[PDB]
Design a protein around this nucleic acid. Sequence first.
DNA 1: AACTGGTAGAGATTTTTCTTAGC
DNA 2: GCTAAGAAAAATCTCTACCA
DNA 3: AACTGGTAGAGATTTTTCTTAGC
DNA 4: GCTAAGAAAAATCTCTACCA
Lengths: 270, 69, 270, 31, 252, 47
Amino acid sequence: GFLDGIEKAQEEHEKYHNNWRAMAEDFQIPQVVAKEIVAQCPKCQVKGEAMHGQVDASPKTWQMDCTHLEGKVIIVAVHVASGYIEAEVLPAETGKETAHFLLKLAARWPVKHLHTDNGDNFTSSAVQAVCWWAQIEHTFSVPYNPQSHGVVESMNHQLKTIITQIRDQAEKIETAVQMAVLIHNFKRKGGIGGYSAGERIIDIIASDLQTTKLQNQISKIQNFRVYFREGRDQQWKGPATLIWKGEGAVVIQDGQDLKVVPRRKCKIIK
Amino acid sequence: IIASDLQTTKLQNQISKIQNFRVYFREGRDQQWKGPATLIWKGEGAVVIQDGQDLKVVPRRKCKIIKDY
Amino acid sequence: GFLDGIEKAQEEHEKYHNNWRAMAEDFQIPQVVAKEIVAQCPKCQVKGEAMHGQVDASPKTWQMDCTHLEGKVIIVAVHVASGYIEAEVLPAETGKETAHFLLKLAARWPVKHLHTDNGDNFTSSAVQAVCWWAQIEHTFSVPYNPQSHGVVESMNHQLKTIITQIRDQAEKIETAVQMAVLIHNFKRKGGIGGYSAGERIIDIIASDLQTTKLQNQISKIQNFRVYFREGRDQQWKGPATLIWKGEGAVVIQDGQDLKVVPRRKCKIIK
Amino acid sequence: IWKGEGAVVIQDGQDLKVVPRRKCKIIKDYG
Amino acid sequence: FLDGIEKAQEEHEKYHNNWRAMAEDFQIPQVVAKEIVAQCPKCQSPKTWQMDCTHLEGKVIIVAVHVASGYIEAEVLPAETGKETAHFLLKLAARWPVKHLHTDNGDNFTSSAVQAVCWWAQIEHTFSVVESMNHQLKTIITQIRDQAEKIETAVQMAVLIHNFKRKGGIGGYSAGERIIDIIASDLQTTKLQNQISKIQNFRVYFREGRDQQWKGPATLIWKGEGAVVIQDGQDLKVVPRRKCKIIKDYGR
Amino acid sequence: GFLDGIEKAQEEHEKYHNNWRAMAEDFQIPQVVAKEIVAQCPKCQVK
DNA sequence: AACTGGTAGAGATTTTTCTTAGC
DNA sequence: GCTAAGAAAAATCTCTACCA
DNA sequence: AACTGGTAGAGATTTTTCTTAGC
DNA sequence: GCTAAGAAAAATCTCTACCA
Ligand SMILES: O=C(NCc1c(F)cc(F)cc1F)c1cn2c(c(O)c1=O)C(=O)N1[C@H]3CC[C@H](C3)O[C@@H]1C2
Ligand SMILES: O=C(NCc1c(F)cc(F)cc1F)c1cn2c(c(O)c1=O)C(=O)N1[C@H]3CC[C@H](C3)O[C@@H]1C2
Ligand SMILES: [Cl-]
Ligand SMILES: [Cl-]
Ligand SMILES: [Mg+2]
Ligand SMILES: [Mg+2]
Ligand SMILES: [Mg+2]
Ligand SMILES: [Mg+2]
Ligand SMILES: [Zn+2]
Ligand SMILES: [Zn+2]
Ligand SMILES: [Zn+2]
Ligand SMILES: [Zn+2]
């Protein structure tokens, strides 16, 4: 048998910390036992699970960060769904200047969600009062994880490369910062629609407003309710709103949730 | 009387085998690996763990979740 | 036409530094002209070509580097084709101790090619005299490019993880270094043949010697020369040595070069 | 098939090909 | 196939050949030839090292020698305590597979530090070749002494000349080629033994020609693509695969 | 882990001589080790 | 004119092996 | 006795951090 | 119990467009 | 007049460094 091999393998891992293939080959135990012996050791288990996530890309989400260049402090804000950049040079990295930059940005463009890191200027009472008055949801990243806001750190890189390209056409650094913002927003194309960033933010916000008005006018004159049968149990749920009846399935709304149900499990009543 | 205890032990066995997981995470400025903690919520990208009566949010790229057989 | 658009596009790139899609869309020139306008600018051209190379993996090649741990200086050497590790703790990072480590290594295992970085201990007259006496070819990497010796830096990582696993079983750091070398060489399996590193270096060197002796005995009694026709011009080359005649092609040796020629372009003479 | 000084001839899936010496590993592979 | 097995058994009954030669001659697989050797009543170390210390020019030289090949590893010690001997033994066991250590009844070899190292690395220590190796190393050291400044350089240069530059023995091999061939042959033996045990955990019910009934449980030796070799009644025989049933066996 | 389950199932089969599906469901060990426990007993047989 | 990224582990997906019920 | 469904155990494939 | 990597450019490979010779 | 070979120009796909 191999039960004595299981005991000798546990003593061997306690001294030498083998991996599972070494024990499964030298003691001739099955591989599930060797994997369990390794999985019950706390001196091992030093490795993550090797995947990446995906940030939020809603049409009113902004991300914000600070960078340094030639002894100055730049503050960068990016519109995530389009790539649109605003930037400024601060005299100090306090919370007063960050609150004023956020107030001017919220006065110019519609902001509803803001994502930042845990720096001392972004976790401040002045930024808290500005977000309260202008009705913004402020969310913070997991600490010491800059991948949670990857768009604004990538735009830090793009801004610094443009600034080194056009540095000899200006005298100060604030002039070169604003020239780099103009070159990024309007003079570089390529991406989703072949647009620049200014054309893309115009298209995204205009499309948002147009599609809300269109489907308000559609949904205010609707009828033809649908009773449908779904779930693990074959029950029947009540009044659902038919949205679009298609070649193969229908789309219903139930309790402010969108669902796609085929034609065999639904009945339409006028 | 006995049959009710059979049903209670079966239901408690399924409840205990649903969500008994351990988590080894990596956190802080100097990112070291720390001891076992209890999994609470698992979304795509990050997890919420309870360690020493403290709730922490760790990404799924910096933690290992060990199940049971 | 678009020739005036070409002139306006050159002035526009001189001021703003557009990419090629912006100029090709705003001035309606073909894309080859816009790519040429960007390619003649020296303020641009800041990007590599996005590939990787492949290091040498001959059966007698070694790579060497130094690392630091708890205020000490470790020196690591790796056999590249198998993954076999030797390591030591040096009292100083000079050239005398590096020459003595290389002399002991060359006395134990056959070394013919050594690859290092450009540190001050590896570019030294003592290491030069040891490589001269023991007949080793010493090659150095491109400066500030650690990817040229990736095997020894990866083994620096593996050694430090094992040392933190077994640190509480020893008192000093030299003891823990030698215990980590034993655990890496003999207690971890998985890889090319399911081997450990010690089994793999034994298999590689034994296979090298066996295959030289076998093909010496084969080639000392050979005959059946082959005249073949190849090249852009249909000429005929002289005496070539037939090695293996196969179903579809033959393998010949010409001027100590191996070639594979099909049957239609070769004639065998006994 | 044949091991040279700078090249190695192998048969791979009924295809004879020539690889450089620094891109090969020759094992007997007990297993 | 079966003709090869019959000729292999008759030739082993005459001359008692080894299994590598029988497999290469009679063109049978290695597990069958190893079973033919293992069934014979008359037919039933690569990891042993020796250590010693010596003196030269007021220094202490410690020498370890692989016995079956004559392979030398040497060093210069600053003292003769048990901690330095334990460090030399730990470095040696970390570089080569050491299973059995043979020494004499010195003080530094009979120590708690050496005992702790042998406990951790699982070596069998035995107290009682190295005299001949000390004499040979001292002759090479005196032969090349004018090329080195210190004694440590001359010691390691003599170890290199002993291991790779001197040829002798039967075929004219050095000590490094001999130690590599010995350890590689032992590795081939252990891998084949793992395959043999994993195959021999099965069982075979076979049906002979001109019958409908299954015979007794014969042990499977080799399971090919079209044929099956079994051991039954102290006899090795080849059955086609369409008259066989292989089932798992639990007879521990 | 199920290693304490392996030890407890060995004590339980030494008393009552269980089968392998019973031990694999009661002690939550994999089926191969439960079949090996039944195989090593000289009085029982896996079936 | 002759230089160069790699190693090992965590999960996910595909494949092979083993027991048992049905005809 | 033969065949197929089901599940367990093993093998392969893609992706990540760290190495001054 | 409600969190998360991304951006843009350098080459390689596949596809579409345009001129011209042959039947 | 119709059709196909050949080459130029455009479109798509995979892979890399840097962002405290
Ligand atoms: O950055 C280092 N490693 C990290 C790393 C890697 F390993 C592999 C990668 F693909 C990428 C990486 F980022 C690293 C740096 N240096 C040296 C190293 O050996 C070394 O590994 C070294 O010895 N010198 C000497 C020679 C001149 C002076 C002293 O500076 C250099 C600095
Ligand atoms: O390492 C940084 N970037 C590089 C990088 C990246 F951008 C994206 C990646 F996927 C990987 C990367 F390696 C980086 C570090 N820190 C901050 C940054 O904003 C920042 O970008 C920051 O603000 N703080 C404050 C909050 C607490 C204190 C001050 O330390 C942190 C340090
Ligand atoms: Cl942070
Ligand atoms: Cl360097
Ligand atoms: Mg920041
Ligand atoms: Mg940042
Ligand atoms: Mg270095
Ligand atoms: Mg290095
Ligand atoms: Zn462990
Ligand atoms: Zn330019
Ligand atoms: Zn015999
Ligand atoms: Zn029993």
